[model samples]
Target: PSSSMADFRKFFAKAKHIVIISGAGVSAESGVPTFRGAGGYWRKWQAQDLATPLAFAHNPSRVWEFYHYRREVMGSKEPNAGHRAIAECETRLGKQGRRVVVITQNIDELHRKAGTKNLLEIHGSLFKTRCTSCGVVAENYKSPICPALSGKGAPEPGTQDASIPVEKLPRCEEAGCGGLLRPHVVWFGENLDPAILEEVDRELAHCDLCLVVGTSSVVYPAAMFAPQVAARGVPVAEFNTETTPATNRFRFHFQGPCGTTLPEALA
Candidate 1:
């Protein structure tokens, strides 16, 4: 056994501020699937096919159906031990006048469900809808999101689009602005929100201990966070199924699914 195990638990007990950077792998424990390259498919389309501004502009109906399906899946899922453990650390540390903050790249709202108070959702959220015209973002959890999408978005191999008319899709309910509402998540070609990034930078700069959970550590900005923090002589811990591109820079690299290991450490 690595002495770093007891060593991490020891530091965790006394750390004043802890920052957890989480990715989709934490929620994968709850059965949320990732459709990343050619291999990950939702019906006939991959995430690359639907999660883009051009895709939405070309076929809003198809794009909305894909999101509606993911929304329902996120809706049906539960926050697993990994998520709860992070939240537990947040709460347990909060009452003692210290802190645990979460900077998550996931848009699935698992951190919110886990009750992590100090959270910055760097990737936006699946349940929020942003009006294309009005630019208003709203938290909406209505199933189907619109009447026409009821019982739609089945993810079978040969699934076809419901071909929902643009107007029939979820639209802005704010005032008379009947503009289109897109999933508030960051798409394939979009930049991360500047405001959220500012907050994340602030958190990372001040954290006493950093935990990286279930991330591949290759995505930008986020991939750079832990190493940059560690360069300052801070302890950066990684919990994942395997080593990553930046794993060598971390102070502790625990090999396992985050669900299996986070509870062991955080809970």
Candidate 2:
């Protein structure tokens, strides 16, 4: 075991501000598939084929199908132990007059369902859809599935305002403009929101502890944070089934899936 294993538990006990960074792997426990590896969603398809700007331009229909399947799959999944554990940790910290913040790269709303309070979604959500022509945001799933897509359009996961099927991709609720709908998720080639990044940096600036869960630490920003904080001497902890890029650099390393490990530690 890493020397900081017990210290991590103690950190949870006393830390005033905690920051948690999570990835898709954390939600994999909930049965949502990944983009790579065998038995994963990308086994037969590439992200570039469906998640890129080029893909959307070359074949919007194919990209639409990929997202459609993913939306239904994600819609069917529930928050698992890791998610609940994080929420519990947040609650515990808040009760102690502290704060626990969650920054997730996942597009799934598992953290929301898990009851996490202070959350920053670095990536856009799969359940959210926006207007194609104008920017009318909807929190509903039944918005008229964008016909601009090439494949079949079905009702997404959640409902927008009450129980409305957003029949015909409800035109921009803004005014009298009938534009198509667009998935609100961040495409692969797109940049992360600057506003969200600023908020996350503020949280990091004052965080006492950082927990990295179920992430490969290969992607930018999220991958770079543990080291950046550790360099500043803040304690960094990593929880994963295998060693990650942050493993050697982190102050603590907890082996195993986050679902199996974080709840016990945070509790």
Candidate 3:
């Protein structure tokens, strides 16, 4: 059975180490497209097809262009009410010697903008770039495929035109290593960074409450956390658009868009 608003307040009041697992649904409230549902395409290529190591191996320029388009669109968005509430919850909890750790599958930096102190980007971020050969990573605010170089009649920031030549794309500037640069994100068919995963496990082991927000809990590893926390006798609450595979496992299930629902529950 679903818990009432009063139950959520009581749970939040008592939690010391709070773990929040967020997903695409939360960012969608901020105008970012759920890439999966949109069938992200550029020149007949799907996002899944382009967001793989093999895809980048075959054509680095195309892959870079795809990510370039994504960054511009993603960067243009602002954090929504749910994001603010999560950060505020952390701030409020901190005063009481409690901690709020956010584990998110999102690529955007909305959590940071919302002032969340302890945040983990399990899927990596759009703003970070890594050299393919040297393994050097750095913050890259500029798009890999700049419109200034995309030539005349180039589409605007939101367009997905993967027509930039490989030679025109940016390269690494790691002193002596001039290797190709790629988005630092964990691509499809890649393992999550073991270090980040380890920290997630460590936090979950000690968390007093779990907030599964805006995710369907269908993706592996991340999806496994809510039930695992619940099994440890920790209270687990879910705020999402609908019931998921693990919905029944949650102690409190609230079905709705998280932008409105999350702030109401957590604030």
The candidate maximizing lDDT is: 1
1-267 per-residue lDDT for model 3 (tens digits): 475879988988888999999998989899885556665445556667877999988887667766766777765899999999999999998998899999999988899989998999999988988887898888888643455334322224455555556555667888888777788998888899999999999999999999999897888789998888988999999999889888888889888899979888987
Highest-TM-score candidate: 1
Q: Candidate 2 versus the native: TM-score? A: 0.85
TM-score versus the correct structure, for each prediction: 0.96, 0.85, 0.91
- Model 1 misplaced stretches (Cα beyond 4 Å): 1-3
Worst 10 residues of 3 by lDDT: 148-157
Lowest lDDT 10-residue stretch of candidate 1: 1-10
RMSD of each predicted structure: 1.6, 5.7, 2.7
What tens-digit string does per-residue lDDT give for candidate 1 at 106-171? 888888898888899888898899999999999998986999999888899888889998889998
Better candidate by lDDT, 1 or 2? 1
lDDT computed for candidate 1: 0.87
Q: Which residue pairs collide in model 1, if any? A: none
True-structure lDDT of candidate 3: 0.83
Per-residue C-alpha lDDT of model 2 across residues 131-237, encoded as one tens digit per residue = 77777767756422455332343333331222123344334665776665556777776888899999998998999888889998887877877777777788888
Full ranking by lDDT: 1, 3, 2
